[PDB]
């Protein structure tokens, strides 16, 4: 039965916006129509804005509680079977308010992403409202088992936490000739936010391993605070015609397609979109054993896992792939297999289709 | 039964942070124990703050969420009865998720000022947060009964809204320190100075006045329209004739002889109560909760709104009688001890609680 489904997060933040508006689109192929309830296609797509009107009494801009009202408005007026949040905060406490307003049934789904464990660790006084969020959830889901046990030591709700794992939606000569590449040339991929938890550090102390080794640029993809900590770590190392400070970037995918390696050298990943993208692409992966990256890459079959600040050992895999073909096409081929299984958007999608048909 | 109860407000907003305030101090001076939640001498009087950050996963810092988290914090760590939120928005919604989270019951009192009618007019679309606000508070008081009426008829929550009103020198020095001669009429305007204030109306009166006498205006405190204030004021050259004061004000109401206050739209106007209690009589618009402060030829006069011409009227009738303006003035204060008395309101309000505790 065709449903009518609400879907409100940041309308695209890396991962879970990308995530979440190609759900949405997918759902809509199958007959589903589709309600996006963000700030910010198909003919069952819509969008409803949340606009914040602050002109006086209140301090801080209201957005919650306007984006809180908003999904009643919206649940009402399309009269809506679902509203799906992504984000515990402020989505999941929002879509509650919302529900309590309409005083109708709607069923309330809830995607963690990681976000709840991040804010949390800023501000552990937080630690309830999660969990009422997650309670006030008729289904919750996690984009790895390894944040759902971490949302289970952190948060302790009384609410089953699903795992639904993240999902994904030629030309290399021209492309490297675009950047300047030689056809010579090994090439590193590295694709995130920069933000402290990603150790760009550590990725530069591993490729400049790796250029004193062989014939290597890194493609250094996205912005962020520690940014300015890269080039100075770049500098510091004499690596600046080496390195593509690429910052974010259009078509990703061309990036990918012209790699050889991709890492991912986290502290903190709950599950990694980008080791997918770079899977698709046919590059192979090494990770920190954190968080939900195990899940994505296995060691040693599809990809290798390290220890976290591990250079030494991280420049060692590296290595291994990059020398040989056989490695990294077996490697290569692990990954393109868990890509058409477990990490399949026709899985996935039908796994939230699942969801929301129980509750309908 | 003494009791512990839980105050947030934003809390100097002028008003409405004056009356939460106090209210809380006059409650521990009866010895409850009150624990203020907020942004931000006595010891059964604590204060909670609330710090708001984005972290980079947030869009906007979420106030809203953080305070509904202190509060349920607050609330089981010391086991409140109460939590008495000022406004309805966001306030009243911050009570009630924390309430939802609480595994205690907890009674929530809402007292409305008047600034859900401000954020309605601004986004109508906030009508029915605003109505499950009302609606999902244990019990709701208002600062008049005009309010009361007006959220009625605006928002249509199905709630009862409660009448619990507001409560409350070397004059020579004072006019000296700011150049006030002793032969010099001394009108007086405080507020925060937005358009329904109707400043430029108690400057076109003022003009009408000292074109008729000698006279000074304080217009006291800031805001957007200080700018169109000041402007009027150069375009009737009454520069020499005017003080602006920012805030520090009962010096002020001390010397001065007549007080304004024109509103096109005010719940109660608490500067009133300041005003009467310095000895210094009032004109006010027929609006609001105004008519419910003044009594019309006793207490002081009313108008309506934007009527300069029956304004200055009033206004020279005060000024020269001195007769009148000592009538009005002790009746006034007579009002004060009586209707607006803390000891009054203050029990009124500790009804309320002794119900729900
Ligand atoms: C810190 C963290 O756990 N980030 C995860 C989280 O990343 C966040 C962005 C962030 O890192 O704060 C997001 O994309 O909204 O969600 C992604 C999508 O499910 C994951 O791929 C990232 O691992
Ligand atoms: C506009 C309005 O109704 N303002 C009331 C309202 O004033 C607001 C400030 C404002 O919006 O004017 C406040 O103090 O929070 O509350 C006061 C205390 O109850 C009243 O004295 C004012 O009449």
């Given amino acids: 039965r065709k449903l009518k489904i609400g879907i409100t997060c940041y309308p695209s933040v890396g991962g ?3 995530i979440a508006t190609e759900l949405g689109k997918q759902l809509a192929e199958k007959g589903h129509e589709i309600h996006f309830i963000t700030s910010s296609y198909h003919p069952n797509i819509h969008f409803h804005e949340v606009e914040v009107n602050q002109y006086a009494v209140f301090k801080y801009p209201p957005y919650d509680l306007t984006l809180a009202s908003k999904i009643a408005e919206v649940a009402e007026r399309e009269n809506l079977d679902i509203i799906h949040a992504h984000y515990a905060l402020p989505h999941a406490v929002c879509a509650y308010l919302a529900k309590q307003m309409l005083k109708r049934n709607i069923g309330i789904v809830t995607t963690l992403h990681g976000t709840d464990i991040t804010v949390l660790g800023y ?3 937080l630690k309830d409202l999660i969990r009422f969020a997650i309670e006030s959830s008729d289904r919750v889901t996690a984009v790895s088992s390894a944040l759902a046990a971490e949302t289970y030591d952190l948060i302790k709700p009384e609410k089953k936490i699903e795992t639904i794992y993240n999902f994904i939606d030629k030309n290399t000569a021209a492309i ?3 950047h300047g590449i030689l056809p010579d040339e090994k090439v590193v991929i ?11 550090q550590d990725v530069i102390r591993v490729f400049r391993n790796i250029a004193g080794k062989t014939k290597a640029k890194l493609l250094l993809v996205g912005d962020g605070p520690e940014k300015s900590t890269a080039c100075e770590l770049i500098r510091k190392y004499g690596l600046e015609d080496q390195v593509l400070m690429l910052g974010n970037q259009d078509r990703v995918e061309d990036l990918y397609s012209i790699s050889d390696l991709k890492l991912l050298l986290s502290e903190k990943e709950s599950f990694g979109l980008v080791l997918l993208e770079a899977m ?5 992966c090494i990770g920190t054993n954190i968080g939900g990256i195990p899940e994505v890459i296995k060691n040693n079959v599809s990809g290798f896992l390290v220890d976290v600040g591990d250079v030494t050992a991280a420049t060692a895999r590296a290595m291994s792939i990059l020398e040989d073909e056989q490695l990294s096409n077996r490697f290569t081929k692990a990954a393109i297999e868990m ?8 899985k996935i999608v039908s796994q939230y289709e699942q969801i929301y048909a129980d509750l309908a």
Avoid: M, Q, T, Y
Wanted: proline content about 6%; glycine content about 6%; charged content about 35%.
């Fill in 16 to 18: 879970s916006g990308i």
């Fill in 123 to 125: 501000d552990p006084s």
């Fill in 176 to 178: 490297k000739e675009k």
């Fill in 190 to 200: 590295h694709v995130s936010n920069f933000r402290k938890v990603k150790r760009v």
């Fill in 280 to 284: 698709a692409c046919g590059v192979p």
């Fill in 339 to 346: 890509l058409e299984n477990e990490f399949s958007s026709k």
